[PDB]
Write a protein that binds this ligand. Structure first.
Ligand SMILES: Nc1ncnc2c1ncn2[C@@H]1O[C@H](COP(=O)(O)OP(=O)(O)O)[C@@H](O)[C@H]1O
Ligand SMILES: Nc1ncnc2c1ncn2[C@@H]1O[C@H](COP(=O)(O)OP(=O)(O)O)[C@@H](O)[C@H]1O
Ligand SMILES: Nc1ncnc2c1ncn2[C@@H]1O[C@H](COP(=O)(O)OP(=O)(O)O)[C@@H](O)[C@H]1O
Lengths: 488, 253, 174, 88, 56, 97
C-alpha cells in the first residue's frame, strides 16, 4: 500500500493480485500504480473457514511507469511529442529545469544543476572489444546539517521515473544489491533483487552515506562503476545488470564541516569511493546575513502557504514545470537522445583535465600528504558524462563547446571547490607590515625581486602569505592583481 | 537439438595459414599484446602477462605424483581508475571460459561447491560453485582485498592444492579445479604509498601473496604529457560510433 | 506543531523533539514517566538496552516458510506519539543516532533482506542526557559539556539546561 | 580569411598548449604583462607565459601591450613557458 | 522549530489561527534555551542582545 | 533477548522482586549493567527495546552491594568518592554507605 496512506502504528499489508492476457508484464516492481479490479476470494492450500482474498486485475494505470518492460520504445503521443520538442527548442530550458528542481529550497543552484544532469544522465556506449563505459553520474552531497540535502534526495526520488530512497543505517549488503533467498516449497535458492535492482535504469538515493557500514559500503563499488552485480553464492553465480545513478548524502566525521580543521580529518572515506563519485559537493554554512534573511523569508513563505501561491503562479508563467511533465521529459530524453562529442570539444576537455591535474600538483605540494579528494581519469569520464547530459537536456545530438564550458563550470564548482579546502609566515607578515605602510601600494615585481631573488623566503611562502593577508582583509589586491595595497 | 553457440571455434585452413604466417614474425608477442584491448592505454607489460595468461604454460605431472602448476596467476594491486577491472572485463569477454566474482558478492561455499537436493530424484548432490565451473578457464576476481576470511580459506586452498575436498552431508568427494586466476585489488590505504612498505601493499596475508606468480603494482602518478596522451586517448574512445547505427541515438602498428 | 505538505512536492516535519540536559537529582526522568502517563502513545527506551534496530524498525525470518518479514521497532509504536529516551549520552553512538530519519524525515527507510520499505514514524523524541563528568560546568560551552555531536544536537528544538545550584531559599521551598 | 592560413600552419587555442612538450605551434594571442611581470599571451580559453629572448620580429611593425599578435614558437612543459621564434 | 513551537502554543488554546502572542512566547522559549545553552561569561551580553524581541 | 522470535530472560535484579538483591564485586560491573542500574534503582523498571520485542519490566528491588576499593585497600586520606569506581549519579542513587 501507499506509505502516505498507511494507518497509525501499523505495517503496510502485502496483498496478492493476478493479471491475465495482455495485462501481464506491464509493471516494473517499485512503481506507484492505480488498479481497478474485482475483489474475489480463492482457496489456498495453507484455522476455520479462512479463505484468502485476492484482486483480479481489470485495469492498470500509472503515469510514473512507462512502456511496461523497457524496450527503448516510443509510446508518447504525437501532440505531447510536439510539446516536448517545443520544450527542447526553448532557449532557456536549462533555467526551467533548474527552477523545477526544489522550488521550496533556497540557494543550492549548482546542486540543482547537478541533479538535472543526474536525471538526464549520460550515454551508454558499446565498444567492439567489449569495453563498457558508464552512462550515469553519481553525486555525493557532503556537508553540514540544515542544508536540506535529504529534502533534495526526496525530491529526486519524486521526480525520477525509476527511483528508490534508502538509508545508511537501515541498509545492508544483501539489501542494496541483490539477495539470495530460499523458496519455501521447492527448497531451492533463488536471487531476489534489492534496492539497486529495483532502481535499474534509474536513481538510487542514499541518506546518511557517512554512517553505512564498512562491509556495507564496499558491495556497491561494482554496482556504481561496472553497472553490474556479480554474485556467486549458494551454488548460483550470475552477473546481473544494475544501471543505477547514485545520489548519496553525508555529513563529515566531525559534527559540522570545519574550515579551521583539515579536510583529511573531516573525511574518513577511502579515496576509492570519492573516485567513484562524480560531483563531490561539499557545502558549508557561511552565516551571511543576506543569506540568512533570504532563507528566513523563503521558509516563512513556505510555512504560511504563500509559496504555494508563488509556485502556482510561476507554473502558469511558464518558467517551471511540474513533476509529471519533467518525469516524462526525463524518460523521453533518455529514450531518444544519446549524443557524441565534436572534435573541437575534445581539445577543450583534455586541456581542462590536464589543467586541473596540474592544479592538483599545486594542491598536493605544500601539504606533503595525499589529498582525500582525488581527481583521476574517471573524473574526466565524469565531465564527459556531464557534457553529454547537458546535450541531452535540449535533445541535441552534438555536444558543442557551449555545453562544454558549463560542464567545466559545474566540475569547478563541485570537485575543484571540494579539493581546494612557520617562521616564514610571521617573518613575512612583520617585514611586509613594516615594509609598505598603511595606504600605499607596491607592485608584485618588486616583491618578486626583493623577496624571492633575495631568497628571503620561498616563492610558495610568498604566494601563500599574500592570500593569508588577503583573507585577513588588512592588505588587499588592486589594479588587475598587479598592485598590493594596504587597506589599513 | 542442442547447440553450444562455438566456445571451441572451428578452425578453417585459411585461419591456420594466417596463424602460421603471423607466428613467424619477430614481434608477434607485441602485435598480440597491443591487439588485446586497444581502448586501454598503458599497462603494456600487464597485457603481455594477460596474453601469456590466456595461453598458459604447459603442465607437467611427475611419476611420483607431484602436480606442477602450468597455470600462471596474476594479482594487480594499485590505485583506483588504473583500469584493472576493465582488464578483468576484457579477459572475461575474450576467454574460452571465464567466471567473475567480487569481494562482497561471494561466499566460500558458493565458490567451490554447494550440496542441495535434486527435484526429479529426491537425492542430495553437489552443484559446482564459481571456482570449479571455470575449470580449464579463468577466474576474474575483483576487489580481492576484502574477502571474508571464510572465502579466503577456500581460495587459498585452491591456490595451494588445485582440488577441493568436500566432506559433508554424507558426501566425501574431491573436485578438480585446474584453472587460472586474475585478480584486482586496492591497497589497505585509500591511495597507494610510494614509501615501498611491504605490509601496506595488500591487506591479504603474504601466504596468499606467495601463490600469485605476478604481483603487478600500478601507480596513478600525476603527470602532464602522458596524462594528456591518456586524456586524448579516452576522448578518442568516447568519440567512437558503432557501425550501422544512427548518429545521436541510444545504443540498443 | 503541524506537518506540512507543499504541493505534493515538499514535506515539513510537525513534531517537536526536546532534550533535557541536567545534573543528577533534578527529576529529569520523572517528567519522562509523566509523559508516558500523559501521551496518547508513548514508548520508552534507555541506555545500552535500546539497540539500533530496537528503535527504528527491524527485519526477521519467520519460522513458517522462512520468509523475511518486517518487525516494528520502538519508533513504529510511536507513530502519532512520543518516544522517550533515558540516559541518552551513555547509549552507544550506533544506538544513539540511528534515529535521524525518524527525528528529521519522520520516516523509516529500510533496505535489507530483499525488503525495501518507507515506513512513517512521526515521533516526538524527548531525551534525557547528562553532562561530561557527571556535572554541568557553567563556565564551559555546550559542545564539550555533552558527548553528543553537532547533527544529533541540531535536530533538537528545545534543549533545557538544568544546573543544581545551592540556594538558601530555593532549597527551602523545594 | 587570409590565404596564408586557409598553407603555412594553423592556429591552436592557448589552453591546448600545456601538455604538448617540445612541439612547434603558431598562435594568435593578446599580448599582456601578467601579475608576475612576465610576458603572456591570452585567448578566451586561457593564457600562457612566453619569453622574448629568441624572437625575430617582423620589421616595419609596432608591438605594444594590448596587441593581438601571431606568435610562432615552441612550448616547453618544464617551467610552463613558450619560446617564441618569430612574432608578427 | 520556532514555527512549530508557535503552532503548538496556538494548538494549546484550541485556536485554529496563530496569534502574535504565540510568536512572542515561541521566540521567548527559543531565546531562553539559547541563552541557557551559552557559557556564563556571555549570558549577560546574550540576554541583553535579544531582550528587545522577548519583552518587547 | 533470546532467539528461539526473541524472548526475555530475567536478570538477578528481576528475580529479587519485592526483595533484596545482594551483589558481590560491585566495582567491576559492566557498563550495560551500569546504565540499567541507573534506571533500576529509582524508577524500579528496566525498559528493553531490542529487535522486534519492546517492553518495560517492573523490578521493585532493594539493593545491598559490597564493593571492594579498586587498586588495593581503602585509603583513609582520600575521600570516599576517590576510593570507589562509581560515578556521581549511581553514588547519589544509593541510600547509604
Ligand atoms: N534552503 C532551505 N529551504 C527550505 N528548507 C530548508 C532549507 N535548508 C534547510 N531546510 C530545512 O531544514 C531541514 C534540513 O534537513 P537536512 O539537512 O535535509 O537533513 P540532513 O542533515 O540529514 O541532510 C529540512 O527539514 C528542511 O525542511
Ligand atoms: N586508457 C586508460 N587509462 C587509465 N584509465 C582508464 C583508461 N581507460 C579507462 N580507464 C578507467 O579505468 C577505470 C576502471 O578501473 P577501476 O574500476 O578503478 O578498477 P578496480 O575496480 O579494479 O579498482 C574506468 O572508470 C575507466 O574510466
Ligand atoms: N522538584 C524536584 N526537583 C528535583 N528532584 C525532585 C523534585 N521532586 C521530586 N524529585 C526527586 O527526583 C527523583 C527522580 O530523579 P531522576 O529523574 O531519576 O534523576 P535523574 O535526573 O538523574 O535521572 C525522585 O526520587 C524524586 O524524589
Amino acid at each position: 500500500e501507499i506509505p502516505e496512506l498507511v494507518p497509525v502504528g501499523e505495517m503496510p499489508r502485502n496483498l496478492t493480485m493476478t493479471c491475465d492476457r495482455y495485462l501481464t508484464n506491464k509493471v516494473i516492481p517499485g512503481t506507484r500504480v492505480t488498479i481497478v479490479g474485482i475483489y474475489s476470494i480463492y482457496n489456498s492450500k495453507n484455522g476455520v473457514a479462512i479463505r484468502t482474498p485476492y484482486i483480479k486485475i481489470l485495469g492498470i494505470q500509472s503515469d510514473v511507469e512507462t512502456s511496461s518492460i523497457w524496450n527503448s520504445v516510443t509510446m508518447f503521443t504525437e501532440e505531447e511529442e510536439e510539446e516536448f520538442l517545443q520544450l527542447s527548442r526553448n532557449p532557456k530550458l536549462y533555467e526551467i529545469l533548474t527552477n523545477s528542481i526544489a522550488p521550496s529550497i533556497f540557494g543550492n543552484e549548482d546542486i540543482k544543476k547537478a541533479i538535472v544532469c543526474l536525471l538526464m544522465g549520460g550515454s551508454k556506449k558499446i565498444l567492439p572489444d567489449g569495453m563498457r563505459l558508464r552512462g550515469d553520474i553519481n553525486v555525493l552531497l557532503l556537508g553540514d546539517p540544515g542544508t536540506a540535502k535529504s529534502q533534495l534526495l526526496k525530491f529526486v526520488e519524486k521526480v525520477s521515473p525509476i527511483a528508490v530512497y534508502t538509508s545508511g543505517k537501515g541498509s545492508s549488503a544483501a539489501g542494496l544489491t541483490a539477495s539470495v533467498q530460499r523458496d519455501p516449497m521447492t527448497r531451492e535458492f533463488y536471487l531476489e533483487g534489492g534496492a539497486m535492482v529495483l532502481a535499474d535504469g534509474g536513481v538510487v538515493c542514499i541518506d546518511e552515506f557517512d554512517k553505512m557500514r564498512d562491509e556495507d559500503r564496499v558491495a556497491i563499488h561494482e554496482a556504481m562503476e561496472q553497472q553490474t552485480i556479480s554474485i556467486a553464492k549458494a551454488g548460483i553465480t550470475t552477473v546481473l545488470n544494475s544501471r543505477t545513478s547514485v545520489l548519496a548524502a553525508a555529513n563529515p566525521i566531525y559534527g559540522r564541516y570545519d574550515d579551521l580543521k583539515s579536510p583529511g580529518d573531516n573525511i574518513d572515506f577511502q579515496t576509492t569511493i570519492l573516485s567513484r563519485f562524480d560531483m563531490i559537493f561539499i557545502v558549508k554554512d557561511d552565516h551571511n546575513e543576506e543569506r540568512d534573511i533570504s532563507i528566513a523569508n523563503h521558509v516563512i513563505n513556505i510555512h504560511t502557504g504563500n509559496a504555494n501561491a508563488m509556485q502556482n503562479q510561476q507554473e502558469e508563467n511558464g518558467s517551471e514545470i511540474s513533476i509529471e511533465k519533467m518525469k516524462r521529459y526525463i524518460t523521453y530524453c533518455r529514450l531518444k537522445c544519446a549524443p557524441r562529442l565534436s572534435p573541437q570539444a575534445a581539445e577543450k576537455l583534455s586541456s581542462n583535465f590536464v589543467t586541473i591535474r596540474k592544479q592538483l600538483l599545486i594542491n598536493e605540494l605544500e601539504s606533503t600528504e595525499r589529498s582525500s579528494i582525488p581527481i583521476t581519469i574517471r573524473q574526466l569520464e565524469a565531465i564527459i558524462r556531464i557534457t553529454e547530459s547537458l546535450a541531452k537536456l535540449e535533445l541535441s545530438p552534438i555536444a558543442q563547446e557551449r555545453h562544454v564550458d558549463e560542464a567545466i563550470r559545474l566540475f569547478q564548482a563541485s570537485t575543484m571547490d571540494a579539493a581546494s579546502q612557520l617562521s616564514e609566515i610571521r617573518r613575512f607578515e612583520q617585514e611586509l607590515k613594516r615594509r609598505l605602510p598603511i595606504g600605499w601600494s607596491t607592485s608584485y615585481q618588486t616583491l618578486r625581486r626583493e623577496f624571492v631573488d633575495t631568497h628571503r623566503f620561498s616563492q610558495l611562502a610568498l604566494d601563500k602569505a599574500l592570500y593569508a593577508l588577503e583573507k585577513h582583509e588588512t592588505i588587499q589586491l588592486r589594479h588587475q592583481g598587479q598592485n598590493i595595497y594596504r587597506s589599513g | 537439438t542442442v547447440y553450444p553457440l562455438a566456445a571451441r571455434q572451428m578452425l578453417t585452413d585459411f585461419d591456420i595459414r594466417n596463424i602460421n604466417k603471423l607466428s613467424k614474425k619477430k614481434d608477434i608477442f607485441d602485435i598480440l599484446s597491443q591487439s588485446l584491448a586497444p581502448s586501454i592505454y598503458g599497462h603494456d607489460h600487464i597485457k603481455k602477462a594477460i596474453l601469456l595468461m590466456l595461453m598458459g604454460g604447459v603442465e607437467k605431472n611427475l611419476e611420483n605424483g607431484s602436480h606442477l602448476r602450468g597455470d600462471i596467476n596474476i594479482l594487480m594491486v594499485g590505485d583506483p581508475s588504473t583500469a584493472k577491472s576493465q582488464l578483468l572485463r576484457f579477459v572475461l569477454n575474450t576467454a574460452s571460459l571465464a567466471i567473475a566474482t567480487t569481494g562482497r558478492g561471494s561466499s566460500g561455499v558458493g565458490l567451490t561447491a554447494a550440496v542441495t537436493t535434486d527435484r526429479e530424484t529426491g537425492e542430495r548432490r553437489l552443484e559446482a560453485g564459481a571456482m570449479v565451473l571455470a575449470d580449464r578457464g579463468v577466474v576474474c576476481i575483483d576487489e580481492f582485498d576484502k574477502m571474508t576470511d571464510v572465502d579466503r580459506v577456500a581460495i587459498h586452498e585452491v591456490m595451494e592444492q588445485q582440488t577441493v575436498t568436500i566432506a559433508k552431508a554424507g558426501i566425501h568427494t574431491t573436485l578438480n579445479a585446474r584453472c587460472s586466476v586474475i585478480a584486482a585489488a586496492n591497497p589497505v590505504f585509500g591511495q597507494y604509498d610510494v614509501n615501498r612498505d611491504p605490509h601496506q601493499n595488500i591487506a591479504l596475508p603474504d601466504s596468499l601473496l606467495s601463490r600469485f606468480d605476478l604481483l603487478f603494482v600500478v601507480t596513478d602518478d600525476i603527470n602532464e604529457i602522458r596524462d594528456r596522451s591518456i586524456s586524448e586517448h579516452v576522448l578518442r574512445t568516447h568519440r567512437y560510433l558503432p557501425p550501422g547505427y544512427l548518429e545521436g541515438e541510444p545504443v540498443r602498428p | 506543531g503541524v506537518p506540512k505538505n507543499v504541493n505534493g512536492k515538499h514535506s515539513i516535519r510537525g513534531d517537536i523533539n526536546v532534550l533535557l540536559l541536567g545534573d543528577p537529582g533534578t527529576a529529569k526522568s520523572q517528567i519522562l514517566k509523566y509523559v508516558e502517563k500523559t501521551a496518547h502513545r508513548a514508548v520508552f527506551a534507555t541506555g545500552q538496552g535500546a539497540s539500533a534496530v530496537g528503535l527504528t524498525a527491524s527485519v526477521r525470518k519467520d519460522p513458517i516458510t522462512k520468509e523475511w518479514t518486517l518487525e516494528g521497532g520502538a519508533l513504529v509504536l510511536a507513530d502519532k506519539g512520543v518516544c522517550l529516551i533515558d540516559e541518552f549520552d551513555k547509549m552507544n553512538d550506533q544506538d544513539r543516532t540511528s534515529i535521524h530519519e525518524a527525528m528529521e524525515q519522520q520516516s523509516i527507510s529500510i533496505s535489507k533482506a530483499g525488503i525495501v520499505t518507507t515506513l512513517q514514524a512521526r515521533c516526538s523524541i524527548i531525551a534525557a542526557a547528562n553532562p561530561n563528568g557527571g556535572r554541568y560546568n557553567s563556565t564551559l560551552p555546550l559542545a564539550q559539556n555533552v558527548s553528543l555531536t553537532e547533527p544529533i544536537l541540531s535536530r533538537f528544538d528545545i534543549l533545557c539546561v538544568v544546573r543544581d545550584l545551592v540556594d538558601e531559599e530555593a532549597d527551602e521551598r523545594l | 580569411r587570409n590565404e596564408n592560413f586557409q598553407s603555412s600552419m594553423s592556429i591552436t587555442p592557448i589552453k591546448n598548449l600545456l601538455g604538448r612538450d617540445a612541439q612547434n605551434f603558431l598562435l594568435l594571442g593578446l599580448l599582456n604583462k601578467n601579475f608576475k611581470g612576465n610576458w603572456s599571451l591570452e585567448d578566451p580559453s586561457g593564457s600562457v607565459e612566453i619569453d622574448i629572448s629568441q624572437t625575430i620580429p617582423t620589421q616595419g611593425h609596432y608591438y605594444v601591450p594590448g596587441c593581438m599578435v601571431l606568435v610562432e614558437g615552441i612550448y616547453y612543459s618544464v617551467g610552463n613557458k613558450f619560446h617564441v621564434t618569430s612574432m608578427t | 522549530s520556532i514555527l512549530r513551537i508557535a503552532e503548538s502554543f496556538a494548538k494549546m488554546r484550541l485556536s485554529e489561527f496563530v496569534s502574535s502572542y504565540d510568536l512572542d512566547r515561541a521566540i521567548k522559549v527559543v531565546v531562553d534555551s539559547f541563552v541557557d545553552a551559552q557559557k556564563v561569561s556571555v549570558r549577560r551580553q546574550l540576554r541583553r542582545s535579544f531582550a528587545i524581541y522577548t519583552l518587547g | 533477548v533470546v532467539r528461539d522470535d526473541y524472548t526475555i530472560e530475567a536478570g538477578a535484579l528481576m528475580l529479587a522482586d519485592n526483595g533484596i538483591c545482594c551483589i558481590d564485586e560491585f566495582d567491576k560491573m559492566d557498563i550495560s549493567d551500569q546504565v540499567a542500574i541507573h534506571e533500576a534503582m529509582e524508577q524500579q523498571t528496566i525498559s528493553i527495546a531490542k529487535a522486534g520485542i519492546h517492553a518495560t519490566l517492573n523490578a521493585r528491588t532493594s539493593i545491598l552491594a559490597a564493593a571492594n576499593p579498586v587498586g588495593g585497600r581503602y585509603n583513609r586520606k582520600l575521600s570516599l568518592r576517590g576510593n570507589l569506581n562509581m560515578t556521581a549519579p549511581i553514588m547519589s542513587r544509593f541510600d547509604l554507605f
